[PDB]
Amino acid sequence: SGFRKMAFPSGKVEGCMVQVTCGTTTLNGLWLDDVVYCPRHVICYEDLLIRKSNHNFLVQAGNVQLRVIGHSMQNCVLKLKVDTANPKTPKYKFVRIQPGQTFSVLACYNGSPSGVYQCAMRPNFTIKGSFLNGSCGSVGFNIDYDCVSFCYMHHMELPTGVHAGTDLEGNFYGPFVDRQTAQAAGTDTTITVNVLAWLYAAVINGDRWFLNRFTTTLNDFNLVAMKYNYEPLTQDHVDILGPLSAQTGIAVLDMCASLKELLQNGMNGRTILGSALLEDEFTPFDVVRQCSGVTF
Amino acid sequence: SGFRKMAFPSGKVEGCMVQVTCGTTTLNGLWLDDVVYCPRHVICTSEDMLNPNYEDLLIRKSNHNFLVQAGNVQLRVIGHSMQNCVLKLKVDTANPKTPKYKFVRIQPGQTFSVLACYNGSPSGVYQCAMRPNFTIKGSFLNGSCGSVGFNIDYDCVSFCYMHHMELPTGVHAGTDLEGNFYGPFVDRQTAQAAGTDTTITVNVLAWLYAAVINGDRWFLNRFTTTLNDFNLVAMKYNYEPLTQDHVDILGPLSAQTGIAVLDMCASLKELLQNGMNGRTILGSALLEDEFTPFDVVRQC
Ligand SMILES: O=C1C[C@]2(CCOc3ccc(Cl)cc32)C(=O)N1c1cncc2ccccc12
Numbered sequence: 097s098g099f100r101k102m103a104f105p106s107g108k109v110e111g112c113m114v115q116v117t118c119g120t121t122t123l124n125g126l127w128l129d130d131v132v133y134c135p136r137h138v139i140c141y142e143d144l145l146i147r148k149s150n151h152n153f154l155v156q157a158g159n160v161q162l163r164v165i166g167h168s169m170q171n172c173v174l175k176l177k178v179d180t181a182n183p184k185t186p187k188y189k190f191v192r193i194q195p196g197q198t199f200s201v202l203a204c205y206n207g208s209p210s211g212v213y214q215c216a217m218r219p220n221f222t223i224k225g226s227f228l229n230g231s232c233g234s235v236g237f238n239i240d241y242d243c244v245s246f247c248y249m250h251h252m253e254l255p256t257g258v259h260a261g262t263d264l265e266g267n268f269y270g271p272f273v274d275r276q277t278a279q280a281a282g283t284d285t286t287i288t289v290n291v292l293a294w295l296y297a298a299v300i301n302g303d304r305w306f307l308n309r310f311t312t313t314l315n316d317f318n319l320v321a322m323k324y325n326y327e328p329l330t331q332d333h334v335d336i337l338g339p340l341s342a343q344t345g346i347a348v349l350d351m352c353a354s355l356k357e358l359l360q361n362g363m364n365g366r367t368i369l370g371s372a373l374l375e376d377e378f379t380p381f382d383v384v385r386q387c388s389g390v391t392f
Numbered sequence: 393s394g395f396r397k398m399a400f401p402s403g404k405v406e407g408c409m410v411q412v413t414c415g416t417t418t419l420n421g422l423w424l425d426d427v428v429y430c431p432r433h434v435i436c437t438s439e440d441m442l443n444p445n446y447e448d449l450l451i452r453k454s455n456h457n458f459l460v461q462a463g464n465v466q467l468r469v470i471g472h473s474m475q476n477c478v479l480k481l482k483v484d485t486a487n488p489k490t491p492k493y494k495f496v497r498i499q500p501g502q503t504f505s506v507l508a509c510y511n512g513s514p515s516g517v518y519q520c521a522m523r524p525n526f527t528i529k530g531s532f533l534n535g536s537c538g539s540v541g542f543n544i545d546y547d548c549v550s551f552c553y554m555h556h557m558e559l560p561t562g563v564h565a566g567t568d569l570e571g572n573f574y575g576p577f578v579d580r581q582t583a584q585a586a587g588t589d590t591t592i593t594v595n596v597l598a599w600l601y602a603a604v605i606n607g608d609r610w611f612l613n614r615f616t617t618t619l620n621d622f623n624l625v626a627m628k629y630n631y632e633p634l635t636q637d638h639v640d641i642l643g644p645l646s647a648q649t650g651i652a653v654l655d656m657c658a659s660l661k662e663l664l665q666n667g668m669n670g671r672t673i674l675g676s677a678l679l680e681d682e683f684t685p686f687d688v689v690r691q692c
Pocket residue numbers: 135137227228229230231232251252253254273274275276393
């Protein structure tokens with residue numbers, strides 16, 4: 097029993113974290129094989145990069161200084177070629193994720209991991225992380241079997257305290273740019289499929305008070321969802337929730353009528369999994385993984 | 393900016409997780425140097441659930457009855473001893489991945505990271521607090537016995553918890569790494585119940601300071617209170633008493649924000665009386681008590 101916000105074990109990623117220093121700027125780099133990936137704002141772009149030499153980049157892996165033998169830029173990420181392949185390079189891939197998908201963040205300062213937490217790509221393409229100055233270059237990842245899928249690299253903080261970054265190919269998530277200028281996160285919405293997955297996790301853990309005898313049409317639920325700033329629920333989402341629906345005996349549209357009552361009436365002093373709000377940072381896959389004990 | 397429930401990076405602990413098998417029983421072990429630590433109930437059978445005599449069961453065991461697996465490698469057990477509720481299996485190989493470490497017994501209210509494992513393989517990491525009733529509200533399934541709780545402070549891993557069992561309410565009980573249980577629990581299937589739980593007051597106040605540091609001030613008020621008057625109120629909401637030690641511990645956050653501890657205590661009294669009124673504090677509609685004053689300073 098129990099349901100916690102749970103991150104993937106960070107060991108495979110800790111072995112890849114290095115410190116990158118260029119001029120007065122120090123941030124984190126991801127060392128995979130003979131390449132160090134980090135945000136291109138460390139040079140502070142084609143004109144600034146051409147003026148740099150390999151020795152201007154100081155890369156430190158532990159107390160060992162790596163020697164940079166090449167440098168190139170791919171979108172908003174800088175790739176520093178090094179003389180040594182990282183012996184701790186795990187099996188990995190670079191994946192771009194969609195809003196609603198969750199991942200673990202290994203927060204680092206000066207190439208040293210300090211914390212790990214779980215979070216979700218918000219529908220407005222921001223992440224509600226926890227980062228201070230020096231965290232740039234920290235990475236978001238998932239683990240599939242023995243393979244690390246890198247999905248995020250941290251670049252900046254928006255005026256509202258939320259965070260913006262890119263995939264490992266340097267493409268930003270959302271309408272953001274990597275410069276000090278006026279940029280605002282769009283109005284956020286709740287990840288509906290994740291709330292439903294979390295209501296199934298609550299039922300699996302013995303919490304049933306919110307269940308009702310009612311069901312709804314997908315169209316009628318989507319009208320209610322639009323009204324409460326909830327993301328639309330698609331037939332794909334309904335299909336994805338199928339295994340949890342089969343395990344608990346509560347059909348997806350039946351759980352939707354429970355969600356619809358919760359949105360119109362509230363919790364009435366009650367909690368679900370120790371929370372008084374509807375939690376939306378657990379995907380259907382996260383719920384199945386935690387309620388079945390999948391290992392890495 | 394931002395405030396999240398944050399665990400320590402688990403790499404140093406992952407390289408210590410092994411699988412320990414005794415007969416039909418399989419759980420997790422912690423391999424540090426040439427010793428594997430694990431819950432002593434790995435030696436129990438179905439008939440020995442209610443009232444096991446561990447000294448008697450252990451004397452009947454030989455080194456080759458313990459199967460220890462680190463990855464696809466089987467380690468050879470060359471000795472075995474019991475310290476309270478933990479079994480210590482001496483092995484013929486020192487773990488090359490042994491970090492700098494120490495064993496610490498923690499107090500209620502203290503937080504730590506849990507590396508949940510099944511069959512010697514880590515599956516997830518999360519942050520926990522030792523409840524005032526000495527239980528933890530973890531996320532554990534069958535096979536999680538031996539999973540450990542730890543903190544990391546500058547390269548050194550302090551091991552503070554080893555998972556042993558789940559109580560009827562879904563909460564969890566375990567020991568320090570010396571095998572001493574936290575709370576009035578025993579490693580037997582006899583009827584056991586967690587005492588009524590209370591809110592960790594000092595942790596809620598630390599979290600209200602984290603909210604002020606992050607820009608939220610709506611819950612603040614012009615009032616202050618006496619320490620005694622706060623305690624008379626707080627205990628009516630099942631909150632732990634706030635001691636002068638707790639007031640002293642909150643001093644640095646009080647200095648950083650300009651809000652005296654007894655002034656923040658008056659904000660807390662008002663939040664208890666009024667509720668949140670549709671508002672949230674650090675994205676939560678409840679008062680969060682699993683962040684210590686030390687965690688708040690570390691993260692902010
Ligand atoms: O370290 C940096 C560089 C900066 C600030 C300067 O202006 C720029 C311009 C471009 C870019 Cl890509 C990043 C930045 C930024 O947001 N951060 C941080 C990143 N995450 C959290 C933070 C919290 C507190 C202060 C800073 C933070």
